[PDB]
Structure formats: C-alpha cells, structure tokens
Amino acid sequence: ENLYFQGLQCIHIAEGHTKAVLCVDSTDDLLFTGSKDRTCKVWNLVTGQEIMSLGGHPNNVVSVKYCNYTSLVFTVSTSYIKVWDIRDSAKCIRTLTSSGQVTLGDACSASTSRTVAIPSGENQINQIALNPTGTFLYAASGNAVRMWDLKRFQSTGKLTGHLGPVMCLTVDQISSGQDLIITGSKDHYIKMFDVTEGALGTVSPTHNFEPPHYDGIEALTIQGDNLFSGSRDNGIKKWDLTQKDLLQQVPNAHKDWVCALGVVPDHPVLLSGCRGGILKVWNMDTFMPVGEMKGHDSPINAICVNSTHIFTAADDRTVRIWKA
C-alpha cells in the first residue's frame, strides 16, 4: 500500500547514565553517549550492551565524535578534548585544549569540583565536528573554531568572524581537499567557511546567512546542498549551500528551543527535537509538517543518525533508538 515515510517507532531505550545525556554519535556498530555524569559510554548497537566508560572529565561531556577509520573517540568537557584509542581499553592517548595545547595522555589530572574553573586563556569548547575523512577536527570555543590536524594532533589555525560564542557546527566535503564548515553562534548568525585542508592561520567566513534567527543557534545538519538550522527562537530554517540564501522556514516550529536536528535515514524527512521533549518531522523539500510525537518526557539535547536508525538524547538520562 504505502512504502513512504509514516512515522518513527522507538525500538529500544539505552539506560545507564546517572544524569542528562547531552550528546550522541553513532556508526552502524557503535553508539557513543556523553552525559552530565562526566562520562562517555560506548555501546554495542547489535546487543545494546555498554562496552566501556570513558571518564576523567572535569565536568559535563557536551560533545562526542567517533572516527570509524582510526577507531578514535573525541570527548569534550570544559576546555578539553580527550582522544581515546578504544581498540583494547579506555585508553586516553591525547588531551587537546581550547588554546591549542597538546598532552600525551590524560591532562585532566587536576582536582575536580562542581564549580567552573576554566582559566584565562581557555574557553568552554561547545561542540566539535570531524570532516568526513577524519583527517581534521574543528573545535568551537569562544568566538572561533580551532582547526586540528588529526595525523599530527597539532592545531593549524582558527575560523574567526563570529561576535558571540560558537555553539554548534557541522562539516562537509563538496570538493577535493576542501572542507566546508558551517557555524552557529550565540550572536544568532550562521556562517560558512571554505578551507583547503591543512591551510595555516586565521580564516574569515565566505558567507553570512541572512536573514538570521532571532536567538542563539542550537543545531545544524546538512543533506546534499541543503542546510537546516534550529534556534532558541523556537524556529527552523532551510538554507541553500550553493546560492547561500533562505529556501524554507517555520517560525515557532516548536513551543520551545529547537536543540537538535537530523535527517531520517532513507526518507526526505527532517526530524527536529525541542527543550519541550517534542519530536516533529518535516518534508525536507517543502517543510510541510508530516508528524508530531512525544519524544521524551524531558528536554531533548541531541539527535544523531546511522544508516538505519535515529537516536535522541534527553535530560531523562536515556537515549531512545528510533526506526522509520
């Protein structure tokens, strides 16, 4: 009868974190969850079993990315990125700082507390992104994005031009040896950077997307030439990455902050999640609504996808696994 997208069904709940789950990443084999409980959990997606716990974070784990090619996990807490080789055990091989410092092993050795202790010359790292090849990491901190060469674990430069903290970012490759970085800021703006891989020094934007959201940018996701943005203004926008202008928008798409976006595997459907715990789905071509459902009975912090499933992370200490 009807083979098209109908809705999402929750097939499993990943439980074990003791506090809010702030971030998720997934391959077809592994799930990565970062929490206010100061850990990242690695999960076997075939069995749902926790494989290992990546600890020693001074505070919340706000962003986590895995590079399948190199088997490296990148976890973010305060002004630190911890780099884990998880082939055998929870082995921290590097700690990177917001300022470009590199420690061999685990630098998060200082006494921990429940009080912010980010010193002068460091900033909170709000989010990281890998390029599709896993050769570069982009780390949003203060009003800039630091570029990390992952073959050397050394910083090459910064993406500058935002006037408030860079809160989110996403990276694509549309050309040979060129990374496309989209940034979202507390300043309400979305910017585009075009970087030749390994280029040294400070890089200014190629484009500012207009007209902007009315409040901070919380979420970004790309499918093909389309960029989707979610904001504290409770709105979603669709941008053309080629023409660099607005295609579709839903102001007041949710009744609260749009904190998470993802593209439903195999369907032309955008999923949005808000601080109200609501999941909405939109036709990506027209922004026609095609469904509303309760995601969680708590704020949703993050969405990620693999080839077959969708994942939501919430304040309720869980990740829900969804299938179309």
Swiss-Prot record:
Q: Tell me where in or outside the cell this protein is found.
A: Cytoplasm, Cytoskeleton; Cytoplasm, Cell cortex; Cell projection, Axon; Cell projection, Dendrite
Task: Write out the ranges of the repeats annotated as WD.
Answer: 16-53, 56-94, 120-158, 161-203, 212-249, 253-292, 295-324
Functional description taken from the UniProt entry: Processive microtubule plus-end directed motor protein involved in neuronal axon guidance. Is recruited by KANK1 to cortical microtubule stabilizing complexes (CMSCs) at focal adhesions (FAs) rims where it promotes microtubule capture and stability. Controls microtubule polymerization rate at axonal growth cones and suppresses microtubule growth without inducing microtubule disassembly once it reaches the cell cortex.
The condition associated with this protein in its record is: Fibrosis of extraocular muscles, congenital, 1: A congenital ocular motility disorder marked by restrictive ophthalmoplegia affecting extraocular muscles innervated by the oculomotor and/or trochlear nerves. It is clinically characterized by anchoring of the eyes in downward gaze, ptosis, and backward tilt of the head. Patients affected by congenital fibrosis of extraocular muscles type 1 show an absence of the superior division of the oculomotor nerve (cranial nerve III) and corresponding oculomotor subnuclei.
Q: How does it assemble?
A: Part of a cortical microtubule stabilization complex (CMSC) composed of KANK1, PPFIA1, PPFIBP1, ERC1/ELKS, PHLDB2/LL5beta, CLASPs, KIF21A and possibly additional interactors; within CMSCs KANK1 and PHLDB2/LL5beta seem to be the core components for recruiting microtubule-binding proteins KIF21A and CLASPs, whereas PPFIA1, PPFIBP1 and ERC1/ELKS serve as scaffolds for protein clustering. Interacts (via residues 1146-1167) with KANK1 (via ankyrin repeats 1-5) and KANK2 (via ankyrin repeats 1-5).
About its domains, the entry says: The coiled coil region interacts with the kinesin motor domain leading to autoinhibition of the motor.
User: What family does this belong to?
Assistant: Belongs to the TRAFAC class myosin-kinesin ATPase superfamily. Kinesin family.
Q: What is this protein called?
A: Kinesin-like protein KIF21A
The top of its lineage is: Eukaryota, Metazoa, Chordata, Craniata, Vertebrata
